[PDB]
Structure formats: structure tokens, C-alpha cells
Amino acid sequence: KLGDICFSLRYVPTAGKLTVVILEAKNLKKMDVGGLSDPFVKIHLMQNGKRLKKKKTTIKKNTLNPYYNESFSFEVPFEQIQKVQVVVTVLDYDKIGKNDAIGKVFVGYNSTGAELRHWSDMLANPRRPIAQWHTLQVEEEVDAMLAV
Template identity: 70%
Template sequence: MKICSDYSFEANLLKVHLNKATDLPAMDIGGTSDPYVKLFFLPDKKRRLTTKVHRKTLNPVFDERFDLPLLYKDIAQKTLVFGIYDYDRFGKHDSIGSVEIPLSTIDLGAPFLGSKPIKSLTQKTLGDICFSLRYVPTSGKMTVGILEAKNLKKMDAYGLSDPYVKIYLNRNGKRLKKKKTSIKKNTLTPYYNESFAFEVSQEIIQSVELVIKVVDHDQVGSNDPIGKVVLSKNAEGQALKHWTGMINVPRRPVVLWHTLEVCRC
């Protein structure tokens, strides 16, 4: 990001010229972004100034000037932040990244001109899903409660999805059972609260695999997978924690959030 700045000791103003940014990541499914920038000081964040939104570009030329009130005695404690966001007409604006300049690191006695790398460029996550697992050993019944999902990947051209959830019970590479939830239209934060029961005896419970897959329904073409969670005794991280919790605390539902992983299928 190309930035110019100059401090006016007489007016107690930091004058900033935000020139342009280059090679931003694509945040929309069309391969572009709608970037804009918020300017503010850390640690207070009290006053935020915002650029115009630049449509469908990864190389926005802002060419905007801002006057930020700043007392000389506060300079050493302030960090100037340029927060870069992707404008979303239908939902929450996504963070692309930021440039942070501790003012103690630059000479405000002379104009500053330079390019700063954008840090923490974010890749869009596939989303998160919350579900419960309950296992009753005596009856060999495993209940999966699909509760809700959030921040799902946008799969439709207008920035939303039509998500539903498929639940697979597999063993030794073979599918034993398959069930699915209802479809929730035009949302990235679907609420389901739907339960599904599977018969899984104690003899095979440690040899089965449970797959929770979120899918975008398409009336015209094929349905597109958004992401999945795979649980078993061989899982890792949150998935293993959830599976182990279900086994170790029988008869009680165990509820956890999971971050969706890429479906390679």
C-alpha cells in the first residue's frame, strides 16, 4: 500500500494521503473484491475515517487525503492503522488485511512517503458449524444434532448460499447410512436444530467414521460442497475432542463448534 504523510506541529494534525493498494486477494466468487479502507489510531480507535468503496478491483487507486487530529505529546503512544475491508452489500464486510505504522518509528519532522506491505491477508474461511453428539452404549444409539452454522462461504452470485447438511456414517471405507437436513434458503447463518439417530453397536463404535458435510443446494446444476468435518477415533484437534467426549460421557449430548475443512470429493 502506497502512503504519504506529514505532521503539522502548528495545527496538531497528521495529514495522510492514501494513494493505492496492489495485488489484493479476491474475496468475491467472481475473482475480484470491493475494497475500502478505514483509518484510525491504536490503542483508542475512537475516530475512524473511511475511503470510498472501489468496485470489482484488486488494485484500487484511492487517492484520498485525510486530516487526523493528533497532539504532539501523544505521538509516541499511537499506531496509525489502515484496515482494509471488502464491502459486502448483503452481509458483514470481510477483513482483507491491515497496515500498521507505529508513529514512533517514523520521523514526523519531514514528510513520509513509502510503500507498506499489507499484513495478515485473510483467506476466506469456509465457515463454522455447531452440532451435538450423544451415544448410548446399552442401546447402541448415536444421535447427531445439527444445530446451526455461521460465516459460510458465499456460493451464489448474489453473495449468499442455500445450505443444507449431509451426515454420513462410514466404516472401513463403506457408507453405512446417510441422512440430511432441510435446505435453508439465502443465508450464510442457517439455523437447523434437527436431530438424526444412527444404530451403532459398542462392538463397532470405534471403527466407524462420522462425516458432517455442508452443501450448497443448486436448483439448476449440481449441488456444491462448502466444507466438512470428519470425526472418529483417528481424528485430530476439535474433531477428536468431540468424538472422545461423546464416548467418555455416554448418554449426555456434547455440543461443540467446528471449523469446516475443504471437501476433496
């Protein structure tokens, strides 16, 4: 199992402010067996297969159950909020070499299941922060859904 990520979503239609708070991850897969797990989280705003904005958390050391409580905001006008994706990836940091993704999820346009539910809850409740757990999924699959 890859692990789970808990984050909040909040949308303020007048200002167009989309806030994502990365709260915690748990049960993360160990990427370097016999090494250490040093997770951080990327948050990407996407539309039509393109990364519009990229943000990331600090790195936590030697943990499969990191707490972050780090907030990020994006500007998404109300006429566009139903056509974007927010992509949340947990990766293992290495000082040398490409960082290995553990897994990822996206919410927003074309999302499904619990990911769509979280987004829908956000939209239906302007200004209200809504926290939810999500199961991390293999990047190969998520990326295929996000492409084009």
C-alpha cells in the same frame, strides 16, 4: 474461510444409539457470488471408506448463518463405535446442477484435534449430549483422509 458448524453428539452404549443434532452453521462461504446461498447439511456414517448410512437436513434459503436444530440417529453397537466416522458436510443447494460442498468435517476413528476431542468426550460420557463447534475444511482434504 469456509465457515463453522455446531452439532451435538450423544452415544448410548446399551442400545447402540448414536445421535447427531445439527444445530447451526455460521460464517459460510458464498458459493454463488451474486446468487443466493441456500445451505443444507449431510450427515454420513462411514467405515473403511464406505458410506453406511446417509441423512440430511432441510434446506435454508438465502443465509450464510443457518439454524437447523434437526436430530438424526444411527444404530452403532458398542463393539463398533470406536471404528466409525460421522461425516458432516455443508452444501449449497441448487435446483439444477450438482450441489457444491462448502466444506466438511468428520469425527470418530482417525479424527484429530477438536474433532477427536468431541468424539472422545461423547464416548467418555454415555447418554450425555455434547455440543461443539467445528471449523469446516475443504472436501478434497477431508475425503482424502476418509478414503480406502
